[model samples]
Target: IVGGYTCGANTVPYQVSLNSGYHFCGGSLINSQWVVSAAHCYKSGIQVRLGEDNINVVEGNEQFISASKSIVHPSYNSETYNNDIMLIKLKSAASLNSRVASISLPTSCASAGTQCLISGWGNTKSSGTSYPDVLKCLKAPILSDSSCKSASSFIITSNMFCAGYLEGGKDACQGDSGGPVVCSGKLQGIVSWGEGCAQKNKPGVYTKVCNYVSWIKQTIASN
Candidate 1:
């Protein structure tokens, strides 16, 4: 995350690292057996590391869980980055504790001006050099679809909303994909894509979580 601070251990308990030797994407533990992330981050052999604060250190509370199944949104478009959400069923349920837990999914959509917290281990630089071992977080406000579309070069679909600053300097960058965008204590968005790391006129785009709440529930129920 750009222009963010390191998150305290256990501060964001639902945060998980999608790792394969190295941290690649961020995911949120939505339930004991289910996780939510961006479809673009899905791959075989990806392990979910929960309760992790620093990737470089062996935090006692960390739990490495294997994915039993990966269910990507059927209509997800790679080119347009629409319906970028994905769900992962863990091989086994994650044990709940103070350092590891699940986050509640939003039942309703987030609106403009809603302040949210985004956390990840993404690169801090626009140049894409720094990938902090420690998790980082930034607070940003949600932008309306119309306002975001005007500011972005890409299409702002109903499946995708934006959050960040018009002036730039703070956003979710590379490696932050699939990370949680928690607004008012609920999971509202998943870091999907952006023009660049905190660039002016290009805020970070996220998978509109509320738009897929029913889909997520259905997928989990049927799977």
Candidate 2:
């Protein structure tokens, strides 16, 4: 998180660290047994650690579990980074408490100018690696689709939305992919992609979570 600050323990309870022997990405715990993340973060041997605020040490509230099932969007386009969402079912249900809980999904899409909070353990640098050991957060407003398109050369599909300053000083980075972008305390977006961290005119792009509400409910019901 460029231009962000370290978060207190359990302050962002739904946030979880995606791991494959190490913290590689961030995710949101949407239910006791399911997590929402980016499809691009998918890899075998993935694990989920709930109630984690720091990546370098063991927090007493942490609940580590392997992925029982990982379902990436069937239409996920790697080339364009469209539909870049995934669901991970935990090997065991999480014990929800003050330190570990689920976040509600948005019933409607987030609008431009909506100030949302994005939390992760991604790189804090605008360029180069400087992964933070502690969770960090940034409050950036959702950019209008028109403004987003104008700022980015990449196609701004309806499945995606952007959030950050146009001048670009704060944004999510590499390891933050699949992290939560919460608006009004609801899960609004997933940290998906960006041009080069927090570069000017290139805001952080995210998976529009509201578009996949039905897909998530249906997937969880039948499987």
Candidate 3:
């Protein structure tokens, strides 16, 4: 979610701040009352703040809503990071506006080499000390399995996918987890984990959204 490291306020309106006193992670609002994030981003007392590009202060269009429930994937493999996705049910739905909206979920899988964009308030680099007050947007093109596996230090499962540069000048760092990895104007992936920010040959890995469409639909329906 960071490259040049700052985005226009409304570029990705579905992007939200998942803060529990601290802006620890970013999430995407898929509908009026539900937000999707990483299963590893589980934190008690997490609140979803909508419609703001900046997190440092309150804005008129922004709404801070409490989550009624936070549902982590049942099969989430903390060890291997497979099924590393989650959903938060907001007590009250977000008010839609030019600066507050929902992102469309993908019906099919995102193919390798699909160019996409990521947005969040994550650190500019892996070794950086501070998180940005302003949100950032970066073009994170999906990498080939062969290309990504060669770059990764861990196993890449079928439930997961990879994005970023093989050459490695752009990436999503800390505080960017659980954010949106958008492709073809749809929610294709979620920022799950990575080796580091913008490291050489190391791209950021994500939860493959298409792989869990059945789980997501059923979970939302039964809840």
Candidate 4:
């Protein structure tokens, strides 16, 4: 696959540290009190800071909502990396601004071949390191259902969908797993898996966000 800035256009806004720097991949502000990110991001003491381009700059005045609780999808299988989704309940409601806003969840739209955007702070090239300080994004079209089925053979179940550059290049890489895949500005997919980062004939796969809306709603409600 061919690669460039277009590959990472859908990158989410993130911060790896408390004092400085911010990165982008894919994430969505679901509500004033919550944000949805990948399950893999919920590591110990790891903070997912939203609404800022620079983690070090207090000048941006972006809100840093701390996670009160990080809930990973129960069915998440580390072995197969299935259901790699999570919800971060914030300690306080996030105040919305132009740079920081919530993304609405779409209860529909889970057909194969649907196009969506996958964004992140991951590597631009395969086997490369994660972007050090800035967030990156890419636009990807949704993979056809039949094509995805053929690609995964037995594993492409209803729970997942595929998205990536058709001609190749743009994709979600290692650090991008669990980021948001947006389509039509609605929450559509979550970064899941792929054969490799930007490999030809292989695209990044995601957890179909719409498929698990019920669980998401319930999870949020219970919280």
Clashing pairs in 1: none
- Deviation in angstroms for 65 in model 2? 0.4
The estimated TM-scores of all candidates read 0.98, 0.98, 0.96, 0.82
Q: Write the per-residue lDDT of candidate 4 for residues 103-132, one digit (tens) a residue.
A: 889968855555565565566667656453
Which regions of candidate 1 deviate over 4 angstroms?
none
Which consecutive 10 residues in model 4 have the weakest lDDT in total?
9-18
Relative to the true structure, candidate 1 reaches a TM of 0.98
Report lDDT per candidate.
0.92, 0.92, 0.87, 0.65
Total colliding residue pairs, candidate 1: 0
Cα RMSD, model 3? 1.2
Candidate 2: clashing pairs of residues: none
For model 3, residues 129-179, the per-residue Cα lDDT tens digits are 667788888887888888778856688998888888877788888888999
Q: Which of 1 and 3 is the better model by lDDT?
A: 1
Judged by TM-score relative to the true structure, which candidate is superior, 3 or 4?
3
What global local distance difference test value does model 3 have? 0.87
What's the distance in Å from true for residue 1, model 2?
A: 0.5
Candidate 3, pairs of clashing residues: none
* Residue 204 Cα positional deviation in candidate 2, in Å, after optimal superposition: 0.8
